[model samples]
Target: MEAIAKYDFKATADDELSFKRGDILKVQNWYKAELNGKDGFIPKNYIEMKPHPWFFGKIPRAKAEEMLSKQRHDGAFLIRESESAPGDFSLSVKFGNDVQHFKVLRDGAGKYFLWVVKFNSLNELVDYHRSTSVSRNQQIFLRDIEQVPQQPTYVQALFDFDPQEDGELGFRRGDFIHVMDNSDPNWWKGACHGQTGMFPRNYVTPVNRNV
Candidate 1:
């Protein structure tokens, strides 16, 4: 996506700064409000932040400031002038193995969320299987096979459609059989109770889909 606008700011006095697409702004206002004895600057429930799978709750302002200060010295954190946006002033930060990009968007009300997208080239499943050090002659299940598909390449996985209802697609993690090879494939085969069944990949291209 095109950046709506851009601004330059130093991460901190000690660390040099580099430009990254989503690494847009640094937010200190929440801490500012907290310093003034404000309530609701941070949500009471952790889910209000719309965190990633690994999210932890808010830290004390002093701790947060200390962490930011260190990150500034280490070039791990950044701050930039706020741009006028719909919600509260927001800053974007980038993290991961230099292969994936994640956007952390926050509003003026302290509501924040993350969107993760992969930016690397696709890695094949067969190569992943060969490289991993697993014992020979051992039966690797579908769930294990599915894990071989790295991030960015969309592989079908069993998702929890209704957790409250105890509903699930029963494919084990990483278990998969490649039924088609092209960008769009027709069939997928997997095991159920030690037997295989066919499922449609049903490749469909959107008329207005942009690559």
Candidate 2:
């Protein structure tokens, strides 16, 4: 899948690709390759599971026309300018006096699609990325999205807690602990049920998550 890097990232490894915001990247194993290679200890704040369809440009001309057709007959219009709002960047369409912006989505293939949850006119859509000072946001196009594959996180444990070790604070599985406080490749910060001191990250998942 293709993705526009929202922030500049440097390759910490030889195989990793370095990129800047707006620079389209071929995302393979978004978290695996996106972050620390196929390594063991992964950060909780990496990429998502399924790639979302949101893009940074206009939706297809044909689809845009269809939506505009539903909006009005004289669907003739133009993309005034793509702008950055408080958190996300979106396109502003001017179809007569009908001014609105539709959230964009990616088409797993390299080309990003402007999700026609909404319209425009005058020409075929062309892509010209306007890079920001480095930022990102939103669940565009679809209402509820496909769930992201899990990553490292400020997890609220599902189990129970108490003073289990000397240095570590005991947390009931329900406790939200700063799990990835330190990066110990082998010590995933999760202590399994009874015997060990370390927690197993897979079993120790998050209580609250991004929707």
Candidate 3:
């Protein structure tokens, strides 16, 4: 029992429409029990987009700070993979509770599906993140099996972003960005002090999925 849903954004001229600085968008995965084993069980339709409302107005620093102080969950789904770029895949979701936070990646590939689950407890989130990672990485067997196998690794790192710096985070046809780690000197150095330097713009776009 797979489900399908069509999603499209209102048409706006490229010049007239732009994602405001700090706007946030999200892609989500929906799990259907019946589609556990059927081919295309994780049909593309199970994914969804959600736009954040805070982008439309100015959010107080205190309020924003409060949201950050609280626990948040963020994740991405690999929908498609390419031969030219092994381990290279398409991402559908880059989301969090804050509206001003967004991710900009570089690369391109075919269409695929993505989903993420957020939580306040690390223990509860470990399994979900691992399971999704395994499914996306093509590590699990999807055939006659009733359910996808759980992944062995759990999410140990978390990344946070501030949407105000760049316009809105965008993605190219085959773009991918690095998340889950802060080892990059450029990203981690300034990021700790609230400054992101020289981020490429080619991989980011502003698509509102709030409706």
Candidate 4:
């Protein structure tokens, strides 16, 4: 049995499914789920199901750490295949000035456990940590999932801009900047001239590596 959708939602974009209140969406997998004889994508908060955008498959430890650093906030995390064990997974979470890696152990019975609590799936374990602290002694909470970057490493500023907020970056026209994360198209994380911050995506264009 699947949980009901609490809110009335209509898809405003492509590949998304529209649903009314009290609709039951059966999830075959995260990102892709089934509706009443139809299949499409749904918002994570719209229904009881959640998509694991944080799950980065087969990423090594160094890669995981570098990726999480781009997020630059506490609780930004992603799950990756364990480098040591083929069937195991690791939870790489950011806190303070460092990223903590925890091994998610899978028992012989196929249950996943971090400490004492056993979960049927990795999604359940991640969901549990979202609200509850991962450790009793520490106040580590899993907040948002950091998706993998789909854009390139560098971008050239097409226009000049000044910072409106402390989180934003100011750049000069034609300045080449190292793009850290392009997960959000509207605003991107980047570094330029010894500063790291968010900048408007439209202000810059991807730098051609071969140039």
The model with the greatest lDDT is 4
**145-199: candidate 3 lDDT, tens digit per residue:** 0112111111111233334365223222432332211234433211112221223
Ranking by lDDT: 4, 2, 3, 1
Per-residue CA lDDT of model 4 for 1-211, tens digit only, reads 2334657678767777777765667632224557878767776545442234678888998988887877746777888986577777989988766778898998989899898999999989998998788776356778764332233358899999888899798799999987655667598867777666789999998777663
Error of 1 at 28 (Å): 45
Candidate 1, position 151, lDDT: 18
For 53-100, candidate 2 gives per-residue lDDT tens digits of 223244444544444334332222233223333323334332344434
Model 1 ranges off by over 4 Å = 1-60, 72-74, 78-87, 90-211
Superposed by TM-score, candidate 3 places the C-alpha of residue 110 at a distance from the truth, in angstroms, of 35
Top TM-score hit: 4
Q: How many backbone clashes does candidate 2 have?
A: 23
For residues 32-89, write the lDDT of model 1, one tens digit per residue. Answer: 1121232122211111111121111243334433433432211122222223332222
lDDT of 2 at 102: 50
Q: What is candidate 2's CA lDDT for residue 125? A: 31
CA lDDT, candidate 2, residue 26: 37
After the best TM-score superposition of candidate 2, give how far the Cα of residue 12 lies from its true spot, in angstroms. 4.1
Q: Give the 10-residue window scoring lowest on summed lDDT in candidate 2.
A: 138-147
